[PDB]
Amino acid sequence: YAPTPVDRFTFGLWTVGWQGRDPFGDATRRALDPVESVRRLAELGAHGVTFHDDDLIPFGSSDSEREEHVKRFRQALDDTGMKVPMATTNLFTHPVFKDGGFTANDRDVRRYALRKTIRNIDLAVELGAETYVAWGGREGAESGGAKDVRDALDRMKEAFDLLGEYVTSQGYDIRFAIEPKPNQPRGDILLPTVGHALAFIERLERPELYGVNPEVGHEQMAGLNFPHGIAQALWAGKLFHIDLNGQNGIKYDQDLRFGAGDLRAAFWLVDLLESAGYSGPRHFDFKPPRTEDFDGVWASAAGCMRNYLILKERAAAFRADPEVQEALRASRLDELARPTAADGLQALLDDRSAFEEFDVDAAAARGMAFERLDQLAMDHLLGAR
Amino acid sequence: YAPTPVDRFTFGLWTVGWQGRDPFGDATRRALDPVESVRRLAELGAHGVTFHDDDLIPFGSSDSEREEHVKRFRQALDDTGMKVPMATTNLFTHPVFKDGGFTANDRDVRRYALRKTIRNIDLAVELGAETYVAWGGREGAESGGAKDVRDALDRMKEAFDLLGEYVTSQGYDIRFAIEPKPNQPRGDILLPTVGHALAFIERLERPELYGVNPEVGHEQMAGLNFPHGIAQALWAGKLFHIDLNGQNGIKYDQDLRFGAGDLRAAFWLVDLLESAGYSGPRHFDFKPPRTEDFDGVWASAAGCMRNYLILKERAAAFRADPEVQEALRASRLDELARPTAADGLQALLDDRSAFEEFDVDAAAARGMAFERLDQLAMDHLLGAR
Amino acid sequence: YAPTPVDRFTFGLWTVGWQGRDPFGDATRRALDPVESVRRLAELGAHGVTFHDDDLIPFGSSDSEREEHVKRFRQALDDTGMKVPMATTNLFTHPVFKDGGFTANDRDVRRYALRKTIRNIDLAVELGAETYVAWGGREGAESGGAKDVRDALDRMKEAFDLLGEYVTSQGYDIRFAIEPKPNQPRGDILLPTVGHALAFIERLERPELYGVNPEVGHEQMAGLNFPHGIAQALWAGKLFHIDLNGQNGIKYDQDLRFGAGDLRAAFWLVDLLESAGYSGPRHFDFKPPRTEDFDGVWASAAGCMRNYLILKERAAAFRADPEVQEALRASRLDELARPTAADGLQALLDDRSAFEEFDVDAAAARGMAFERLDQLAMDHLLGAR
Amino acid sequence: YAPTPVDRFTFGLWTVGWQGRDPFGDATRRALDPVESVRRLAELGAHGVTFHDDDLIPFGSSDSEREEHVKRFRQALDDTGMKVPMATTNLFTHPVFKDGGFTANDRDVRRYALRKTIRNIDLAVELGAETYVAWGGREGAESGGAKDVRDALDRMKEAFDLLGEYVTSQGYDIRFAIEPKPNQPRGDILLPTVGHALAFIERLERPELYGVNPEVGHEQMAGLNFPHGIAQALWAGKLFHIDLNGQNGIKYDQDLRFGAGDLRAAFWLVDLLESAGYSGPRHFDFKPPRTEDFDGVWASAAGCMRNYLILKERAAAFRADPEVQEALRASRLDELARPTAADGLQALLDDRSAFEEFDVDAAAARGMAFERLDQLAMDHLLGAR
Ligand SMILES: OC[C@H]1O[C@H](O)[C@H](O)[C@@H](O)[C@@H]1O
Ligand SMILES: OC[C@H]1O[C@H](O)[C@H](O)[C@@H](O)[C@@H]1O
Ligand SMILES: OC[C@H]1O[C@H](O)[C@H](O)[C@@H](O)[C@@H]1O
Ligand SMILES: OC[C@H]1O[C@H](O)[C@H](O)[C@@H](O)[C@@H]1O
Ligand SMILES: [Mn+2]
Numbered sequence A, B, C, D: 001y002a003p004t005p006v007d008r009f010t011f012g013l014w015t016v017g018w019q020g021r022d023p024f025g026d027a028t029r030r031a032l033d034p035v036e037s038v039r040r041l042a043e044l045g046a047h048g049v050t051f052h053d054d055d056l057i058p059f060g061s062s063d064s065e066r067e068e069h070v071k072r073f074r075q076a077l078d079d080t081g082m083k084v085p086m087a088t089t090n091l092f093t094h095p096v097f098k099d100g101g102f103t104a105n106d107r108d109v110r111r112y113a114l115r116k117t118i119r120n121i122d123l124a125v126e127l128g129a130e131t132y133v134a135w136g137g138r139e140g141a142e143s144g145g146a147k148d149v150r151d152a153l154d155r156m157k158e159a160f161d162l163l164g165e166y167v168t169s170q171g172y173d174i175r176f177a178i179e180p181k182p183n184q185p186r187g188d189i190l191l192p193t194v195g196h197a198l199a200f201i202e203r204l205e206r207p208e209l210y211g212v213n214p215e216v217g218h219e220q221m222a223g224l225n226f227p228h229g230i231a232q233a234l235w236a237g238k239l240f241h242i243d244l245n246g247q248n249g250i251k252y253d254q255d256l257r258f259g260a261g262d263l264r265a266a267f268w269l270v271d272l273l274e275s276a277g278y279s280g281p282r283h284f285d286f287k288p289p290r291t292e293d294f295d296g297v298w299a300s301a302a303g304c305m306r307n308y309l310i311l312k313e314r315a316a317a318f319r320a321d322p323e324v325q326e327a328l329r330a331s332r333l334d335e336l337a338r339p340t341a342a343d344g345l346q347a348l349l350d351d352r353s354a355f356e357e358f359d360v361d362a363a364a365a366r367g368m369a370f371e372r373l374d375q376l377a378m379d380h381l382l383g384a385r
């Protein structure tokens, strides 16, 4: 199960380069030079990398240090053939962002957050990124009175509408993806799920420039079904990007490697992405645990990819299995894909078979045969057919 | 703290009339006649009641029994002055709806679910209802392969678009509210939160006819902040109705009386509804616990109202308190309500005070003073000023 | 992957005989005659069945109907070779138990609950049961003031101590297992987890008669790791029985078939049970979903067993894999099984290599190699070696 | 509502001295000198402080720097009258503890963890501490195969048994309290709840030396009822210490000030502690949010105390209220405190009123009147009588 660049696997620089600092402990690993991560990931078979501004250029770097960092990184991309499909901004680490960036109560901070983002959009475009992610990790509150949410949503829409004016006036071909998270590091984060992000999009001045970048474990932090959410984002035509990882239930953000956490959910996610022809990057936003040395970091990264390809093969087997096709029919999945009333409203109202003469008892008595189907899915997932 | 009908408190017939059957136990109370609940609630000071079809007219009633039930109920409404501001359909109890109504895999069942809903919309309009709620409690799955979600969302949009054609072609002044629930009785329910419902609305053919009816405990079943959600629904102009109740965290749907559960959340909810001028009904969808006899059912109902009025008084006190106004200013809530860049994009980009000469350290150092504000909110909530 | 009676698979009568009544819906299946379930499960390869009193003998049956029910059931057990290794009492369905059985506030109800249990212990002993389970599903509260917990725990210990006097004075060879559940149908249930049950046991007059019967999904309802809990119960020598099933996170009790829910957790559970030589029954307390007809009920039951045997084979493969043995050593699992200080306290204190001359940095730098090991476990689980 | 030292309020040095570093951000506050925190808290009315070793003496300090730090701290305690009732060890921050201290897989690390703890027990005893807390924040795993739990529990019991030999052989009057946490920073922590800790205690060689130090938000991280847990620990006679704070449901460890989070739970906690005569310290383990400057840190600390005293007054009012006493009787709380069968087993079995002639229907019909009682509790909590 060997990845190739045609699999479009990507990694954040902050992923394999996580040092292991957690709220109760110090770093357990040395910093990695982004050049060195690009080389190592290229060897493992990745397609590309992603970055926040501050991962690539140390906060408070001069225009000339900034130059030199970008040039070195550009050489590593040239030497390995790695691409940069997505970039993002850090509006969460520096103390100035303690109450948010775009929805900080202090106006001067909201202004600075905009300008910091605009500077990186330009960079992202120079390096060939097609999608620009926004994760408002600091947009939220620990207390009720601290954030008037309606005002916050105004400010949030104001910032996104301004980004969108910028990119339109510059003629850039970059689209935006909002990344929802329900909590952590704030007590409650604004736009906490895929639905909240999707709803909010529809209120921007130019909605066609914005989609979502949902993350497996974030939605699972609210106990939601991640494939269902992704199906809703696909149905809206808004799945611009996706972050893949693992989460063991409702608890702090674990960012385990893909396939770890809820495995069956990983299976139905891959089945969905592949059957709906999602063609974007398969981006891993994971942290190798702080128990690991560098060898462990590379093994965790490889494991991400391996588990995708294994789950890709089993889901493909599932759907090609004639016995599965027969069960899908037994379960009336085919009828679900037929319109309920293509005949129209009037015809429905005049059709006695839909009400006055509908046999509710006999309809009630039909089993759905879902358990047989789900065990077929289990046997395929475990390679036990 | 005495309710009056001008408080617009309402109750579902199914609330006080819950018999106490739970998945592990039999009824502990006798059935109540809807006439008797209307009278008792009128005495307690309620404004009105709501109903599913099947609460009012026993499933499988003739056209003439249906007549007689409606006439008796109409007399009780006339005798007490009670209104019926909202109605809804039961598409969840009968076995025929075991895989859903609008998104059942079997097409014939989807058709019947539509016709059952249309019959009640007419009734609801006769009785003066302004809002028609849809709670798709059976729309969902326990397993991955049983429900193609994109197909399901098609079917769901098809049904709502058809309801909306019906009401438009009949000239009715009724609007629809979708009620989200994340799970139970299905393993995962479609449109599981306020955001998912809001997003979905925007894809209907006539969005202006549809809003949400969020329920305190449902959103809390996914660990979300309910006031934040309600602020988002208000911001979208979609809060058509609201169900009030209590939930003790992430667990089965408790439907405790309003004020029970997360009390501070009830406080910030009331503060929001009242400050934003929500003028709809204050509807309680609660179950008096199965430990209670009829006296207990009426005491629980009264408690719903009492807790609203107590939390209304304390939130009003909070916001009128000059020391609170000073703290809100200390916390820069006023600046949050100012546009980040009314000057426009170009002016922002040319303003050196927003970046090149912005003093990040001194901005970083300013405290937000949120803890002082939140303790003011606590002292007001507890009457300890 | 075919079960045999030597696999010791058992089923509750209430499992396959669940009619599908949930809090929002009516039955979707007809009642099954216990004789018919015994025959069908014997065919599927089960070893035995379990029962509450009230599943076997309808509540309010005469001494003579009681006779006739027991005799018919005894014939089915004789005809099929099925055993009854566990029994239990229903102290949760009848209205009289609305505030509990053993910890009801009303004393007369606590007395009746004892006598109802004692009558069934005798029956259980006649039918050859070795373990008698207690699930206090109604012992708890929705509100703070309703249950003085210290008093409740007195009452709870009083009842168990009385059961234990009864069985000792009768000379029965039956042991008791407490089954923890954190909530549902009460807002909070007493002894909500495995640990709480284990702790409580140690306060009974004869602790050696009582262990736990933990259930996969119950512990997962509190977000706990179920294999860790089971390891603690094994370590205490208290795993007398176990209920196997599936749960998709923190939400209502789903009781999905074994292997559904958190699959990786099912894998590490089976690896534990098998490596520690648990020899008790492998008992499924699941509900076939209400979407299913009778064929679906039997397919769900078979699936329970199949998934156990598949996960048994993969865990066995994992532990026999020399590359896994090498990784376990690489991860110092062997050193974990060595005493930290067999040399004793004084020797530890005098050993400079443990402190004054311990090289913390070089110890810090060693990776644990856990990610490589966990991917080996993943490849074995998926059959991808 | 002014605290005095007779209220026995304490604070960890790490609480008010938290700098605000979270997993996604840098410090927002400067470090505080422990001398300065002792003075400021004494002014606010606290009784005392607690410390980990490493809060007081920087890790890697010489024997002489260690001397000088302790002497300065001792002077501040002398100047203010502050006591040190509890101490603890940091076995979680340094990289060496990445896989735990007492249950690290590497034996040499387990040895060092013991010696680091023993050195501080001596210090704690010199400063007058009566309780020594152990929080095994790093004892656990992210993956199944990394930690054999039975072996881990051996190691855990080995370490505690060794601590207990040390203190017994030195003649110290210090007792140990284990502090449970279900997760974070590990994926699952060993002894994740109050019950698991209580159960484990009973397996130590000298159980009478060990109790629990439960923390409000930790138990709430598993969705448990914290007052119920504390009632169980009191019932076992093991509540040696308690950490008070606030948590908004199942999510990362928030450590909000006491009274924030689940307010009603804070109320029933205080009602319990006060009615059962808990005489230990009322210790706050909270973090002032990172939004706050130093003024905010002191306001948050004061708020902790204020909310305790306000909830102390309301619970006291509740229980003295003759109408509440009447309701408690109406709800048969008095009967719950009476033995179920002081008459004994034989008398129960011979008492026909307990079974053959027990009127189950009439018992079933009695309401428990719990909702009236709970609204009395609400009116008292809000000062609305
Ligand atoms: O979206 C940008 C990335 O920023 C941070 O590292 C967030 O924790 C991560 O989840 C997000 O994916
Ligand atoms: O929405 C209609 C009502 O239907 C059912 O009783 C649901 O449980 C309830 O939550 C919903 O509010
Ligand atoms: O323990 C007896 C059995 O009783 C009920 O059916 C409980 O829901 C089940 O979980 C328990 O296993
Ligand atoms: O127990 C010692 C203290 O150590 C750490 O600061 C833990 O996070 C805290 O919860 C615990 O109370
Ligand atoms: Mn994440």
Ligand SMILES: [Mn+2]
Binding pocket: A179, A215, A243, A285
């Ligand atoms: Mn991400």
Ligand SMILES: [Mn+2]
Binding pocket: B215, B217, B218, B253, B254, B255
């Ligand atoms: Mn509800």
Ligand SMILES: [Mn+2]
Binding pocket: B179, B215, B243, B285
């Ligand atoms: Mn509702």
Ligand SMILES: [Mn+2]
Binding pocket: C215, C217, C218, C253, C254, C255
């Ligand atoms: Mn269960």
Ligand SMILES: [Mn+2]
Binding pocket: C179, C215, C243, C285
């Ligand atoms: Mn069970």
Ligand SMILES: [Mn+2]
Binding pocket: D215, D217, D218, D253, D254, D255
């Ligand atoms: Mn904590």
Ligand SMILES: [Mn+2]
Binding pocket: D179, D215, D243, D285
């Ligand atoms: Mn603590």
